[PDB]
RNA sequence: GGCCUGUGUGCAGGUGGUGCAUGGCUGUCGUCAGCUCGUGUCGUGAGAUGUUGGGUUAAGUCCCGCAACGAGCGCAACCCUUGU
């Protein structure tokens, strides 16, 4: 199955990779020609894992399931959280607190103060406190709110986790693959292959690549919840 | 029965000992800013992380970074006096 043309991933930018210098040895079997010290990505390979993954993906969430959408880099930040408000599913754009997939039982707290916080706003008492301690209450809420957006509406802990860049997200992918969760992730040459369980060949560093390979998968949650 | 006088019987009474058996109270490092815990992670383990780095402060005071996220006892505040 196959959504997008692989001209428009030609013209996307999606088969220029980084330089021969940083490239992980896995990766032998998805580069496939090297063109002015740049690793080229093999675009059969792409979509036969991009079949591979949208039938994973759309299986999970027709069976009622939630996938992390995971951007750190500022490529893909504003793309990945736009595409997670619309579509419906938690998200992370800033930065991966350590410990929120594995510790989830601590930092839902901090989610229920961001609860408490908006709700004392809410009931609008402000001159009832310290005009300090109520300027420490709005960077507290901003701290909060900046930290935490997807995960606010996401409860009942994730099902597959979605990340760019593994090799900057590093964390994330060990925490999923600790918990057992499966890993669905976009590969540059520097990436490795085998702590990705359901892999898609692509560029991470390109914001044109990034929007369009997790908007595919985007669709590909919204077409599996609308098969619920 | 209240009351003491007696003879005894228990017994009282000990500023007698051990602060190297103790409780309680107090000095001291020092009113110095530090000391820890929960869950998570790293290590076979003792343990580490957080509490490290940059800046700032009377201060682990606070901000920005970070496999950590929070919390507690401390700092500050609430109390009395003095100045309008």
Not at 90 to 103: A, D, E, K
Not at 197 to 210: C, F, K, T, V
């Amino acid at each position: 199955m196959a959504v997008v043309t692989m001209k428009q991933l030609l013209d996307s930018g999606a088969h220029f990779g980084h330089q021969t210098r940083r490239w992980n040895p896995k990766m032998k079997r998805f580069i496939f020609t090297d063109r002015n010290g740049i690793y080229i990505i093999d675009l059969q390979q792409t979509l036969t894992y991009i079949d591979k993954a949208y039938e994973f993906v759309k299986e999970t969430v027709a069976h009622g399931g939630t996938v992390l959408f995971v951007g750190t880099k500022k490529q893909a930040q504003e793309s990945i959280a736009e595409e997670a408000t619309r579509v419906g599913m938690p998200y992370v754009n800033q930065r991966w607190l350590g410990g929120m997939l594995t510790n989830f039982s601590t930092v839902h707290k901090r989610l229920q103060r961001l609860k408490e916080l908006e709700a004392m706003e809410q009931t609008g008492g402000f001159e009832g406190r310290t005009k300090k301690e109520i300027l420490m209450l709005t960077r507290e809420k901003n701290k909060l709110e900046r930290s935490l957006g997807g995960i606010r509406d996401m409860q009942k802990v994730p099902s597959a986790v979605w990340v760019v860049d593994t090799n900057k997200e590093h964390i994330a992918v060990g925490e999923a693959r600790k918990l057992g969760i499966p890993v669905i992730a976009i590969l540059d040459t520097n990436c490795d292959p085998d702590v990705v369980d359901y892999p898609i060949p692509g560029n991470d560093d390109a914001i044109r690549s990034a929007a369009l390979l997790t908007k595919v998968i985007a669709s590909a949650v919204a077409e599996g919840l609308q098969a619920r």
